[PDB]
Amino acid sequence: SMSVGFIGAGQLAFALAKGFTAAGVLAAHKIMASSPDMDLATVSALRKMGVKLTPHNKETVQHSDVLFLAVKPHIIPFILDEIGADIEDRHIVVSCAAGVTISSIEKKLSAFRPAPRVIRCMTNTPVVVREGATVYATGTHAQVEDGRLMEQLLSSVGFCTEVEEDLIDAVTGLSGSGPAYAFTALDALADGGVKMGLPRRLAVRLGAQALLGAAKMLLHSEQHPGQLKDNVSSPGGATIHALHVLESGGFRSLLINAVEASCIRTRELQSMADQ
Amino acid sequence: NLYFQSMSVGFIGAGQLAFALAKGFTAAGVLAAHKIMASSPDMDLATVSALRKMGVKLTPHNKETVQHSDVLFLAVKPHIIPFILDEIGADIEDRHIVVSCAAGVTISSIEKKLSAFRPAPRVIRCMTNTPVVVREGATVYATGTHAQVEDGRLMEQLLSSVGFCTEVEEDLIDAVTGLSGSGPAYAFTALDALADGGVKMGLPRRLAVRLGAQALLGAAKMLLHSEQHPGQLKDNVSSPGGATIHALHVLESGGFRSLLINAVEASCIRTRELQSM
Amino acid sequence: NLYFQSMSVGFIGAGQLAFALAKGFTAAGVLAAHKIMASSPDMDLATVSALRKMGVKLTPHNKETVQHSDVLFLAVKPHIIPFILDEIGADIEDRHIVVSCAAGVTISSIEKKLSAFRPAPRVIRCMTNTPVVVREGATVYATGTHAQVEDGRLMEQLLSSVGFCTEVEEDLIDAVTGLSGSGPAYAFTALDALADGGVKMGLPRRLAVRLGAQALLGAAKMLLHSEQHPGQLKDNVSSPGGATIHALHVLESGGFRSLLINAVEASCIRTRELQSMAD
Amino acid sequence: ENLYFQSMSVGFIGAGQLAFALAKGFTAAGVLAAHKIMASSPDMDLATVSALRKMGVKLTPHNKETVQHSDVLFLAVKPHIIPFILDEIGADIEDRHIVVSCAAGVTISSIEKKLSAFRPAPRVIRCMTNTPVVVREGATVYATGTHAQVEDGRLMEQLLSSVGFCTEVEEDLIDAVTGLSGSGPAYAFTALDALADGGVKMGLPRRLAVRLGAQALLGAAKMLLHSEQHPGQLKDNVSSPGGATIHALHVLESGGFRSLLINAVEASCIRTRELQSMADQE
Numbered sequence A: 001s002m003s004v005g006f007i008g009a010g011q012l013a014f015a016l017a018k019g020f021t022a023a024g025v026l027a028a029h030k031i032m033a034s035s036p037d038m039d040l041a042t043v044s045a046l047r048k049m050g051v052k053l054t055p056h057n058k059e060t061v062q063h064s065d066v067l068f069l070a071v072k073p074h075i076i077p078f079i080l081d082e083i084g085a086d087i088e089d090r091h092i093v094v095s096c097a098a099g100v101t102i103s104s105i106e107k108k109l110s111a112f113r114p115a116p117r118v119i120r121c122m123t124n125t126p127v128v129v130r131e132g133a134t135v136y137a138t139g140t141h142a143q144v145e146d147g148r149l150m151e152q153l154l155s156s157v158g159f160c161t162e163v164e165e166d167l168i169d170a171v172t173g174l175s176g177s178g179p180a181y182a183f184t185a186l187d188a189l190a191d192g193g194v195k196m197g198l199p200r201r202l203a204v205r206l207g208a209q210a211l212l213g214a215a216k217m218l219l220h221s222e223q224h225p226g227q228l229k230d231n232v233s234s235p236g237g238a239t240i241h242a243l244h245v246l247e248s249g250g251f252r253s254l255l256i257n258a259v260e261a262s263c264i265r266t267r268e269l270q271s272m273a274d275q
Numbered sequence B: 001n002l003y004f005q006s007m008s009v010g011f012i013g014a015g016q017l018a019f020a021l022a023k024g025f026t027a028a029g030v031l032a033a034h035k036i037m038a039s040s041p042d043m044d045l046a047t048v049s050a051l052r053k054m055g056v057k058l059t060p061h062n063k064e065t066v067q068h069s070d071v072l073f074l075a076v077k078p079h080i081i082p083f084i085l086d087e088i089g090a091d092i093e094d095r096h097i098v099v100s101c102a103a104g105v106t107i108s109s110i111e112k113k114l115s116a117f118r119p120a121p122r123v124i125r126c127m128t129n130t131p132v133v134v135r136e137g138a139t140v141y142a143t144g145t146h147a148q149v150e151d152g153r154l155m156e157q158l159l160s161s162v163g164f165c166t167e168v169e170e171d172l173i174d175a176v177t178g179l180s181g182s183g184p185a186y187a188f189t190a191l192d193a194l195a196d197g198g199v200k201m202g203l204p205r206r207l208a209v210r211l212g213a214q215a216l217l218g219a220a221k222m223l224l225h226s227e228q229h230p231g232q233l234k235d236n237v238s239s240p241g242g243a244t245i246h247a248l249h250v251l252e253s254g255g256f257r258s259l260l261i262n263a264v265e266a267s268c269i270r271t272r273e274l275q276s277m
Numbered sequence C: 001n002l003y004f005q006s007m008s009v010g011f012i013g014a015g016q017l018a019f020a021l022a023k024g025f026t027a028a029g030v031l032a033a034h035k036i037m038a039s040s041p042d043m044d045l046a047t048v049s050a051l052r053k054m055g056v057k058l059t060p061h062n063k064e065t066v067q068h069s070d071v072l073f074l075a076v077k078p079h080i081i082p083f084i085l086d087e088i089g090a091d092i093e094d095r096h097i098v099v100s101c102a103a104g105v106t107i108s109s110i111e112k113k114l115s116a117f118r119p120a121p122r123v124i125r126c127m128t129n130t131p132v133v134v135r136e137g138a139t140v141y142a143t144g145t146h147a148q149v150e151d152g153r154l155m156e157q158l159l160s161s162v163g164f165c166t167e168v169e170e171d172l173i174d175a176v177t178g179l180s181g182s183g184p185a186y187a188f189t190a191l192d193a194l195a196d197g198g199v200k201m202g203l204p205r206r207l208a209v210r211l212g213a214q215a216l217l218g219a220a221k222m223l224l225h226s227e228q229h230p231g232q233l234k235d236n237v238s239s240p241g242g243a244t245i246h247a248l249h250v251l252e253s254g255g256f257r258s259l260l261i262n263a264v265e266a267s268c269i270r271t272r273e274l275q276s277m278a279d
Numbered sequence D: 001e002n003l004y005f006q007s008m009s010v011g012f013i014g015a016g017q018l019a020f021a022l023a024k025g026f027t028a029a030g031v032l033a034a035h036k037i038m039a040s041s042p043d044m045d046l047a048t049v050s051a052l053r054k055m056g057v058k059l060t061p062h063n064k065e066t067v068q069h070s071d072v073l074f075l076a077v078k079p080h081i082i083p084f085i086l087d088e089i090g091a092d093i094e095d096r097h098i099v100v101s102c103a104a105g106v107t108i109s110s111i112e113k114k115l116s117a118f119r120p121a122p123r124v125i126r127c128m129t130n131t132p133v134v135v136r137e138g139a140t141v142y143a144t145g146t147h148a149q150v151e152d153g154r155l156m157e158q159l160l161s162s163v164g165f166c167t168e169v170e171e172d173l174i175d176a177v178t179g180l181s182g183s184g185p186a187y188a189f190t191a192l193d194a195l196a197d198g199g200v201k202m203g204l205p206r207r208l209a210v211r212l213g214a215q216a217l218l219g220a221a222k223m224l225l226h227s228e229q230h231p232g233q234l235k236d237n238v239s240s241p242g243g244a245t246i247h248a249l250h251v252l253e254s255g256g257f258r259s260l261l262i263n264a265v266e267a268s269c270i271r272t273r274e275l276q277s278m279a280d281q282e
């Protein structure tokens, strides 16, 4: 029933559209995506799944009730200037761009019509397999039903919860960048399996399965990750020997460093944008 | 499903792995909790308390578990295996499939002990992990000298009900131990640290734990469902000049990859040690 | 309301551990100082002068300690134990319970020496630590081949009066040595360093020592009285974006956890070495 | 005992970990009845809130009700929230109130500046305590404000002494105390988790390793508190020549163990000064 549009036809638009249609919450023919470079492979992949495509951002606005801004953050101000006069009372504008504040979006759109309905979200690529992690904050003029609607839609493709907007840059450093930390870890674990004699294909499968199962255990347990760790570690055994070498390298500190670096870079980029 | 029609399972050991497998098997609906028996020298453990509430029959006598079981899981520390085999070895019958879950303990060592009692013991060596409790385990197995072809198939059916399962040659199992056997502990360490990072940057602990676990689960599922190399999936996350590539740099500067290689290696080498002694 | 009216305790050795146990036992009220005897080859020790103030009986001669005592603590350095056993082996009687506190020294080695003189020596191996002096020790023990069930129950009753005490299998004792035997030294090092940190940030040394020690005492008590994982208690300290989580990050960046694992391992390995050199 | 018969009403603005720990400690000490405590929170869905409710503490979403109920009012919210709180309930602070700020870094001066716009002589005490008040072994320091009476400081010390060590300090020491004993229990929990991992590596069951390590730390801390000897002298007494302990102390030294704990106290103290200097600019 709902009309959804994507300004930007890149990886996030594809991941969301694929997740939404796989969830059955949207029909692909009721989704429109716009792109300045109608030659990207994501544009061909979106066409393959049945999404309507166009090179005119104005056409996406006119087709859509819910409008996802899935362009790079530095492109958001240009998009808002281009379509701001075409936003109407019915529109919910959902910015997925890292760093970009609700304030900055509302300021641009309010020059055209007052009370723009804005939602800011931070999600990640695993929405493509319906296991995303999404947070959102509601704007000044977002109606109560707007937030509930967005949580219903985004919950179909993974975890979703409302947050205060000032948490979103930190979320970006944790679950926004998080999949890349995991892909790095899985490549390295597979290298370790190969060093010890496993075929690469088996090593990749087992490492990914180990990470998936541990993550699901933690999500389904009431227990602290340290207690679950204690349960793996038999006295004098193989696991506790491996945990020691992780500790000796400061493994934990590197992951803290990563979340911090991603969060700080997100803040830094938006400070550059506000100036 | 005919494999599991009237099959009885027994656990020698009532620790973390016996609970995890029993919880996995029952949640999968392949075996009924009362068709499972576990034996422990210390009934005062927390795992023994949960198994009891599950409906799993407990006993202090390993011989009772052997007589009641068709498939017999050995879920004890590797150094107890030869003392267990001496105890119940005269009770192992031709009908038994003995599944050793101990790290390092070789099929050959088990067959040598049991062949002194009856000449063709059916032995399978297995390496699994605790996420079988949520039916997302990672399991490999190797079949012994006298294991029948249906024994391997039954093993694969049973262990596939609680996660990934594949047959391997036995000489890969120590390496699998270092990767997916110990793997969940690396992940739990990583998730604790990632949550600490979220807390440092201002998130509540409960939200940080949930987001980090969901990110890891989703990334792992993406890789399992993709034909692309993990490096290509990584490249797709990292926009030029962006937050993710800045974070990946600090991981690289601390040798993040080498620590995980070190871990797989250290767990595998310890597993070889536990066998050689 | 515990008191061992028929027990005479002897210490061979009058060093730190003998004083600590005698002080703990007497402060607990379970033993009168005059029913305790200690022997030492160096009668001019600081710990010897302190035992005398408590009223403990002192003698230079280990044979007198043996003759006076029913429960005999061997509180000497590990390499001295075999010389001690040769010296008093012929004086061990049926009534004696020999409690070895020496790190590394196996029940088997003690029983082999003593059995040359009289079969069936009653031997218990103990690993305890200096905080027994304030009745907050951590003690494990393992019972020997010829120790009766009541011997272990008695020693657990005695050692529980000065702290935590539990029976373990003997093959755990070298690892316990690396954890709770050496543990108090790890804590004293940490408390000195924490106080230096407080002083760097402007606190008087005396206050910094007091606050750091109270922080460690309270946290340890919290964990002992809680069913929660130390990571959960840690999480409760750490407010988002706050002071504590910033400090935890710098501990992690230096591999703080790995150093403590290194320490337990090094103490345990050295304990195993010392014994393997003895045999 | 003398405090119990004072029949004091206590309020907490904030119903998080510190409010729970102090409420738990005060009620376990017998100085306060649980139902004489009221706590408020903008989020009533917290686990600490449910624990307070089970204890019998009164809970309300309205800070004004906590203020009106209280004689001693603890501010147990995050530092950046304190000025919003003071704006909200400043007009409700009465001459009879003692206002006790627990927030890291927040200065007496900043609190008095807000509250003085309403009544002229707000009685303010700044304290830094820690979570082991829950087992009555906290470490607490406090500094008295401009208008706190001598009886106010003495009442504060009596109250906080019921749940651990408590002493008055000059306010300029509190940021350093925060880095030492405020954050200190988290350093100890990290150390205990690691020591237990070490015990497990060397073959102990986890439960025993946790118990032994915590007992070792408790006993050592108590030894130091009851000794007039330097911690280096107590360390020397543990370490027999050539023995296991001195080998372990060497590997601690080779990793810079001492420097890491100095780094920790410094980092916590510096962050505490930043939390204030940030809010000061704002």
Ligand SMILES: CC(C)[C@H](O)C(=O)O
Binding pocket: A232, A233, A234, A237, A238, A239, A240, B101, B102, B103, B177, B181, B182
């Ligand atoms: C089986 C293995 C992975 C076990 O967890 C160990 O730590 O030895």
Ligand SMILES: CC(C)[C@H](O)C(=O)O
Binding pocket: A098, A123, A172, A176, A177, B237, B238, B239, B242, B243, B244, B245
């Ligand atoms: C979503 C965000 C974290 C993206 O990965 C980036 O680096 O811009």
Ligand SMILES: CC(C)[C@H](O)C(=O)O
Binding pocket: C237, C238, C239, C242, C243, C244, C245, D103, D104, D178, D182, D183
């Ligand atoms: C140390 C205290 C003030 C609190 O635990 C924090 O981390 O801010």
Ligand SMILES: CC(C)[C@H](O)C(=O)O
Binding pocket: C102, C103, C177, C181, C182, D238, D239, D240, D243, D244, D245, D246
């Ligand atoms: C028994 C051991 C812990 C003692 O401290 C030593 O170093 O010999």
